[PDB]
Amino acid sequence: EVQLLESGGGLVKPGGSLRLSCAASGFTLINYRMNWVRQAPGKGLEWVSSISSSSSYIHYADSVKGRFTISRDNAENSLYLQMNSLRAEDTAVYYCVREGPRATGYSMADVFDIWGQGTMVTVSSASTKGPSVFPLAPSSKSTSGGTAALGCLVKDYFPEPVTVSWNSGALTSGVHTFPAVLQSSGLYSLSSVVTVPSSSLGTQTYICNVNHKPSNTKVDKKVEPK
């Protein structure tokens, strides 16, 4: 009910620019001080920027100064980050976050008590490449006792992330989606597996739903036995 829905992000060339936005539902922006926090793949959390309710007090982290403009639209219950002149080092997941209610204008700060799902931003010279999705067919060689393993190989894509769901979200138990690994080609590869009752192999349909937003690739591969 109380939450922050983020949009924007994706692949951008060095020197390029990108605009993030966040929409709040379940509460009213006007009452809280709003921030952006980033987290680079594999590392810690870094405060990026903050904006008081009236936009009268605005601050930026050193690393970002001059290039980023935060702004706020209380009427629309929205928050924005305009990012210009982007660099490799700005590659990260960006979260919009609400500061707790004791934070006002220029007072002592409060805790980051509400976080958006985050938006990935990749600053790269390389053009995007959509994955190839290959089945990992269940067989007598992916079967142990009563359970069989099947899955999808999501190969040669750039940049991150790729999302994988099974049967449009229905199937979640037994699912192991692995962290992408970087290949020698400099492209990413990732695989998702599920373990299911052997008994069900003939009767239950198994599909993986691969989404790669950056290249507009939405693939739905059906995985077939033997």
């Binding site: 980051f112 089945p135 393993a149």
Partner: protein
Amino acid sequence: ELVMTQSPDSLAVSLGERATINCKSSQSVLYSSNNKSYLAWYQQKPGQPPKLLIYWASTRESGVPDRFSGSGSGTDFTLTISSLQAEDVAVYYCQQYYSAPLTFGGGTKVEIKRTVAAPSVFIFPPSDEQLKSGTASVVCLLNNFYPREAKVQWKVDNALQSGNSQESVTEQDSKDSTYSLSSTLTLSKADYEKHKVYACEVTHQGLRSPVTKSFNR
């Protein structure tokens, strides 16, 4: 700029036992008047935003189970989870919200200590779909084992491979506290057809001796 230093980097604790993490800040975050320490703890689980646990050093957020508790004042703080649960595995971050810019500790990874568990090993030959395009990926899967460390070795026609594989390991499972591992052997369709016996050889403390899964083609 306040620097937050967490300790240890990594922690492993038996289920239901006690996990304690430390946070030391370069300066005191104790504010005279209100006498509160402006320190917070967050929990981050793989692929999720941090969740707030504790604020002002020792107050639980609404809805945070009481096994979570923070202590300390000024410069030294600790997060302790009195009885660790399988689902409490995450990276834990302290943050000072005392003076700007707000800063975070480098995070501490909290894992579970389980008894050793042997991997289930599965092998997958390349798809017809992928062969139709000149590439051949062979996938080896190690399912639900412990500890994390496992050695996966590919032998094509008994020839020990190298430089042609990638592996990936999941994060610790939030129910059974195990790991899974996926190793991919890639060959050009050409090289793939110049051989018969593809094999995955797995070595792991849960196995009495190495285990081999294979097939022909």
